[PDB]
């Protein structure tokens, strides 16, 4: 049965980000303005065109589609095609209420690289962690079985080395070409790559190997078809591991943010304090006060 948006009204305030490459748009709206004090609340709505399902397209092309001709020369032609309902799914994500930090995170990237030494992290980034971080209530809801419980693909229930593997928020689950799952560990308080020590080795291994094996069983997708990594910086500071189809150029899979789990494990095995001592490189928005702070300590 069809539902509604979880608020009334949407009045556009700002296009936060738009891209013709992946055909996505991120909108900041005011919602629920006819109640209470009348100022309404902030919501983010993300709309993304979906990947094609090849069998449905071939079936369309076999018939008489609704078309307009845009270009035509000799053996080459371009049309505008207007498919029937089934091919028209738009993937819609809603963040509501959206905080100021959400609004900042999605906004128009003017990004800059920074190389963060271990000491920068300990002295500058860690103390200012709160401002970088979004609520992880959603993570607790999965781990506590209060949301997404029927989406769990695999769970190792061990309170220290265990994890839950679920389809990622970004994936609409309708085809395997952009397969994307997230694994969140049961153990609390591992903020990021920086907290990782050899004590986490059994946890990391179970994520990598039991995650791959669960994906093989559920989706028939082999491990050499997967690109499995974490982000630094993450947006949610509870360790989370992304399992993506290798054939999908996943957004956020760039060398300036993604770190392969197999390699994180081998670094820990070669070098116990690798993630507390070494320098990690990532991108921050140009006006991010953390950037300013990090730049300042990099001469002063």
Ligand X SMILES: C[n+]1cn([C@@H]2O[C@H](COP(=O)(O)OP(=O)(O)OP(=O)(O)OC[C@H]3O[C@@H](n4cnc5c(=O)[nH]c(N)nc54)[C@H](O)[C@@H]3O)[C@@H](O)[C@H]2O)c2nc(N)[nH]c(=O)c21
- Hey, which residues between 137 and 156 contact its own copies (CB under 8 A)? 137-138, 141-142, 147-148, 151
Cβ 110 to Y ion shortest distance, Å: 18
Strands 240-245 and 226-231: antiparallel
Sign of the Cα torsion 230, 232, 235, 237 reads positive
Pick what 27 binds: its own copies, Y ion, ligand X, none; C-beta below 5 to 8 Å, kind-dependent. its own copies
Residue 11 in contact with its own copies, rule: CB under 8 A: yes
Placement of tokens 């000491």 in the chain: 119
| Interface with its own copies in residues 40-59 (CB under 8 A) | 45, 47, 49-52, 54-55, 57-58
102 binds ligand X (CB under 6 A): no
How far is Cα 261 from Cα 228, in angstroms, rounded to an integer? Answer: 6
Residue with tokens 């000799």: 74
Is-contact 193 268, C-beta < 8 A? Answer: no
Smallest gap, in angstroms, from Cβ of residue 174 to Y ion? 12
Vertex 107 angle, CA 103 and 109, to 5°:
145
138 makes contact with ligand X (CB under 6 A): yes
Q: Which residue has the tokens 């900041």?
A: 28
Residue of the chain from 172, 285, 293, 297 that contacts ligand X (CB under 6 A): 285
Q: At 296, give phi and psi (nearest 5°).
A: -60, -45
Task: Out of 258, 264, 268, 290, name the contact with its own copies by CB under 8 A.
Answer: 258
Binding site for ligand X (CB under 6 A): 22, 24, 46, 48, 73, 76, 93, 108-109, 138, 148, 166, 168-170, 182, 231, 234-236, 240, 242, 251-252, 285
């Amino acid at each position: 049965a069809p539902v509604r948006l979880p608020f009334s009204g949407f009045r556009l305030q700002k296009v936060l980000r738009e891209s013709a490459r992946d055909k996505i748009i991120f909108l900041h709206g005011k919602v629920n303005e006819a109640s209470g004090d009348g100022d309404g609340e902030d919501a983010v709505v993300i709309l993304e065109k979906t990947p094609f399902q090849v069998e449905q397209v071939a079936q369309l092309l076999t018939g008489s589609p609704e078309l307009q001709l845009q270009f035509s020369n000799d053996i080459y032609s371009t049309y505008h095609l207007f498919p029937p309902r089934q091919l028209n799914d738009v993937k819609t994500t809603v963040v509501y209420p959206a905080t100021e930090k959400h609004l900042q995170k999605y906004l128009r990237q003017d990004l800059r690289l920074i190389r963060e030494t271990g000491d920068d992290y300990r002295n500058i980034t860690l103390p200012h962690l709160e401002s970088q971080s979004l609520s992880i209530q959603w993570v607790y809801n999965i781990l506590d079985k209060k949301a997404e419980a029927d989406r769990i693909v695999f769970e190792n229930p061990d309170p220290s080395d265990g994890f839950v593997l679920i389809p990622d928020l970004k994936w609409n689950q309708q085809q395997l070409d952009d397969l994307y799952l997230i694994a969140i560990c049961h153990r609390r308080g591992i903020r990021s790559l920086r907290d990782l020590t050899p004590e986490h080795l059994p946890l990391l291994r179970n994520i990598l190997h039991q995650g791959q094996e669960a994906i093989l069983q559920r989706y028939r997708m082999k491990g050499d078809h997967l690109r499995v990594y974490l982000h630094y910086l993450p947006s949610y500071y509870h360790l989370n591991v992304h399992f993506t189809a290798l054939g999908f150029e996943a957004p956020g899979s760039g060398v300036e943010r993604a770190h392969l789990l197999a390699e994180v494990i081998e670094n820990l095995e070669c070098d116990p304090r690798h993630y507390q001592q070494r320098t990690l490189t990532f991108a921050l928005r140009a006006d991010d006060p953390l950037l300013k702070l990090l730049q300042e300590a990099q001469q002063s």
